Amino acid sequence: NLYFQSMMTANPTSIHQRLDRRLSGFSLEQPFYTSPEVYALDLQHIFYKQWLYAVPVCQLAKAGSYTTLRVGAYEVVIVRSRDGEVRAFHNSCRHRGSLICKARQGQVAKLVCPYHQWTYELDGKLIWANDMGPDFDASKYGLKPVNLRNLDGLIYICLSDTPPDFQTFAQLARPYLEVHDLKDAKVAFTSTIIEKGNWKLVWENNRECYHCSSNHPALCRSFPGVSKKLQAHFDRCEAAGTPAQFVLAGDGQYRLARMPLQEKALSYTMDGKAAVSRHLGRVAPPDAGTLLMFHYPSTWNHFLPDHSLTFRVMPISPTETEVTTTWLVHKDAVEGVDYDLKRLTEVWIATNDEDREIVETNQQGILSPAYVPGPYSPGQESGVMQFVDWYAASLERALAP
Amino acid sequence: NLYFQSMMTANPTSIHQRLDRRLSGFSLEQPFYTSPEVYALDLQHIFYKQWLYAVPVCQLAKAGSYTTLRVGAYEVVIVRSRDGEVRAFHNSCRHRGSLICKARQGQVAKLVCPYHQWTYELDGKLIWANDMGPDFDASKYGLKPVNLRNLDGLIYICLSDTPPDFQTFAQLARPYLEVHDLKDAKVAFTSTIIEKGNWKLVWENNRECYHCSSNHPALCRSFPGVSKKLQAHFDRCEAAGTPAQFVLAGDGQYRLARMPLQEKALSYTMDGKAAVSRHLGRVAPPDAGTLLMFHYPSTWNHFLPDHSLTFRVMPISPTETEVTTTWLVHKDAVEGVDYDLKRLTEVWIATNDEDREIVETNQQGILSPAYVPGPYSPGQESGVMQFVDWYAASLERALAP
Amino acid sequence: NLYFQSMMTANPTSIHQRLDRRLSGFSLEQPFYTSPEVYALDLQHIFYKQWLYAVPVCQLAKAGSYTTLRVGAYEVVIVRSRDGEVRAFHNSCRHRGSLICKARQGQVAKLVCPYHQWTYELDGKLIWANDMGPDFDASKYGLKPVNLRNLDGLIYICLSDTPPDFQTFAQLARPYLEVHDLKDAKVAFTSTIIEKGNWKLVWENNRECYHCSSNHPALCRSFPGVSKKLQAHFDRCEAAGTPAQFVLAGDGQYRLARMPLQEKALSYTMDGKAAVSRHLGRVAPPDAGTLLMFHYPSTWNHFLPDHSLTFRVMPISPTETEVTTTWLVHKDAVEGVDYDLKRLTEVWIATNDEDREIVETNQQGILSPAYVPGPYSPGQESGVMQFVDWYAASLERALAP
Numbered sequence A, B, C: 001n002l003y004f005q006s007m008m009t010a011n012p013t014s015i016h017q018r019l020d021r022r023l024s025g026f027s028l029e030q031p032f033y034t035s036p037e038v039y040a041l042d043l044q045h046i047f048y049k050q051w052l053y054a055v056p057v058c059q060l061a062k063a064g065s066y067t068t069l070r071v072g073a074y075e076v077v078i079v080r081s082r083d084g085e086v087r088a089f090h091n092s093c094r095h096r097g098s099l100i101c102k103a104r105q106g107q108v109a110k111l112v113c114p115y116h117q118w119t120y121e122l123d124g125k126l127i128w129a130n131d132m133g134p135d136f137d138a139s140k141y142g143l144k145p146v147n148l149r150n151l152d153g154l155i156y157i158c159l160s161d162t163p164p165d166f167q168t169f170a171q172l173a174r175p176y177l178e179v180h181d182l183k184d185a186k187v188a189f190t191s192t193i194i195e196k197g198n199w200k201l202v203w204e205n206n207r208e209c210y211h212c213s214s215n216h217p218a219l220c221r222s223f224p225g226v227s228k229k230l231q232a233h234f235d236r237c238e239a240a241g242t243p244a245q246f247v248l249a250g251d252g253q254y255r256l257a258r259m260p261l262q263e264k265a266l267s268y269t270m271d272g273k274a275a276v277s278r279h280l281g282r283v284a285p286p287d288a289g290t291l292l293m294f295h296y297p298s299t300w301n302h303f304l305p306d307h308s309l310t311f312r313v314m315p316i317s318p319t320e321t322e323v324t325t326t327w328l329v330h331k332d333a334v335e336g337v338d339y340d341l342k343r344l345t346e347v348w349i350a351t352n353d354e355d356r357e358i359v360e361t362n363q364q365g366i367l368s369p370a371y372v373p374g375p376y377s378p379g380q381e382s383g384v385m386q387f388v389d390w391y392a393a394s395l396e397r398a399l400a401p
């Protein structure tokens, strides 16, 4: 309701003027975080144009296996086709538009629409349509495809018919990710939450640890030009065949780095030790730490020697964002034997809840018409500024006539 | 929320251009089913201008008896006046605007506003107003009336001050309906549900049985130029004094036809036999089947030899529609003796729930910005096309300067 | 949902033309009570520009004590500063905008933001900010203040940087209020409710007792040029040092009058007797009755010899209004000894619920597109007209170029 109150008296969003006068050292003016007009632009120009992380490919290990997701108002279905390729389609029947797959996941022989049973093969092709006449050309009524790439076991999609370059990022990232053998994972746990903040607020909060000391007791135990200590850490990883070195995109979109953990910590556990005894991938040394990877606007990620976590950021409304956290473990690791579910997840479930509380409290103060932009900490918040620059530049380029 | 997501990035509704390029062989472009702009037009120009089925007149059998309903944002009260006429008024007090009748139904001597007790007679006339002065003319402050017609026991209303012609339809329909003696009915059961689809989607789904084979196991047992078999069926009805022949409005608004049922079925029951042993009206022969009647935009109807069902379609929002199903039986049929409530209603309660699920699943895929119009089946969906033509033509004529 | 339905087909709000043709003898045209456009104007020009009652100052009796409230989309914090002054600030951190105080009330040493711990003194001054560099000037990043006045124990605020004159009203009211010793009160009970009516509807209903006879059985027992009887009542109060005489603002904004109660009643109790045995203030005589005070747009008030009630009116949306009723009693009156909570509150809790029902029923009829303005009763509704004139004039003056 704060959102509605705030809406009423807001000055016009005059987006070009706001972008023109924006200073990189400062939080965004209110309508970036609260307005429906900027939200529609963020959808149209960011989420509907960039590559987005969807799910781990291991969720689609089986024959005829499918999983569905919403991206803004798009309903997407991702399916393992007959020929073993993974493909993605718009989950909308070409007859009258019905969703075809209604469950979050399943297995099918064919994609059969529940309304009137137009039946499609798993590559999208319409192979039967009831009583449509002889003037019906089934070749014009195949499922609409959705661009898809496999990033070394992690499925990404893009809803534009003209997607940007994914290959540069894929080629940069393979070395770092291939060593995790993600295609041999299974999902041990998924947690989906809604945060009552604009997606930008979720990213700003992710891209600093300025707030961590006070707000993240559990994570702090394990989670901490290149400094001396740090290069030394990259050197042990790389000496052992485990790529680790800081890579930052030219345009700031993604970043990869294998960072050391605090103290004697090996993993994101309350005791600091490995959560899973049967490791996912061949990372060495054991204290190689965490491979941080972000790709804007959809995902941040921690790949550890024993297990991995992917984080998917999706917009729900101007002041709501769905965060999906997926724990990946070796496909033959056994719950109750090789890992304990509580021990595996408790750290990040608590961290996520603490972040959500912070983001939500932040959003509420921002909705005040008295909110003005404020200065980011150069020492503590340069990753926030780095995110906000990427956003603003993406938006300016999409708005260019 | 899908509805909100979808809204953001939608292209302008440019209604004239959409209507201009519309082809009758195809489902509507997205904003017809999802947009608030077309929804307001549908209210203003369709629901607020056409005659609408409201309720069976038997709900108003008693002296001073009233029933209320909402039509979009209109609150209407229908009352049996002192002189035995049924009249309808705007349920808004002429003083400061309060609802007068707050319950769904009741009986009163007078209509007394609960705020300040301005008191009206049952023909709308204000007969007392407290301490209003001598410069108060009560004759200017009678309830505002609502146009009303009685279709042979079924009350219809129209919220325009200039209603279209109802008499043509009334004169066509009397022969078909008079034989059901609807004025001697009682309501044995009413079911009200909300479907999460645009009202148009509810009508398209009603006007085909393309989806029935797969989706309606219960109904299929009883529910199936003029063909040979069919004319033969009309001939037995009409030979016996029971009008049955297909009548379709010039402008496509309504339609009446007494159709045969499957197999040995006499009624909409799980066993195919009559639900009520004491029949409503004098229909013959017993296997005369069902009198189908639709009148756009508000109602479809099945009148059987033993009992009848009316269906009222009312818009709630761009993606919500209230369907009210009323089972009418002879006023002296006794629950537990002449009929069993479960046996009377189970078929259509399940059918309605199956239709609602289908409509809702259809609406969700339509909200995808990838939804495009698709071709209707000429063999299976001509009634859908016939409905969509009536809608588009109604809207084009209202938009004409 | 009525609100949404109503919205769709409404004619433009053309506010100037509506104000131009407005007649003082008549209820407002629909969009004043139902539209989001007039709601935003009411926020921007009324609620965000006038002085508003916030809370009793006794809620802030302690060192470091604070209480928070929302006014439209503003989040405000009121704090007892180190030096004993009460001050109000925008509850938004100057760093990235977070709420600082999250609870409704509490005590602090300092105002410490929960996100990153920027720490402020209780006068607003930022005294520590972590790792902001040497180019950080903390003097530019103090909390934004909110104008505040103390009306003889009752805290008022104003969100404009250029508040209107409060002193005239404060100087008129002190004599009437000082005798209640409000600074020595405590809150014995607070009740917060939401009424589903526009705030204007809540005020119109407050400003008449045209509806009371039928709708307020409990209150009627105690609640009833200057008439003879009435001047006689003011004369006993004033003879005894208790100011009582009718004072109405020049511009109609406020009004004060100590009115007599019915019968032998001394207080707002089911039995008519004093609710609290230990009196709040030094009012005499004992049957001095109730000091009525209203100040538009935020508050009406009953100050009795034994206890007092303040009523705070805040807008939530076009058809929702939060009413907060606070019972004040002497700070040393003891619950269970000097008063019984039920006996103290039952009359106004029931009255408020009856008013809310009436306002809600009124709002629903108003949402009908058939609602037209109607005539107010000159004898019974002149206070309603007096309120509506104040509103319209306030709005016209704010809209003046």
Ligand code: FES
Residues within 6 Å of the ligand: A093, A094, A095, A096, A097, A098, A113, A114, A115, A116, A117, A118
């Ligand atoms: S909507 Fe899919 S078969 Fe008809």
Ligand code: FES
Residues within 6 Å of the ligand: B093, B094, B095, B096, B097, B098, B113, B114, B115, B116, B117, B118
């Ligand atoms: S609103 Fe109906 S009598 Fe006043």
Ligand code: FES
Residues within 6 Å of the ligand: C093, C094, C095, C096, C097, C098, C113, C114, C115, C116, C117, C118
């Ligand atoms: S938002 Fe308050 S310290 Fe950062």
Ligand SMILES: [Fe+3]
Residues within 6 Å of the ligand: A205, A206, A211, A212, A216, A355
């Ligand atoms: Fe965090």
Ligand SMILES: [Fe+3]
Residues within 6 Å of the ligand: B205, B206, B211, B212, B216, B355
């Ligand atoms: Fe159906």
Ligand SMILES: [Fe+3]
Residues within 6 Å of the ligand: C205, C206, C211, C212, C216, C355
């Ligand atoms: Fe009242």
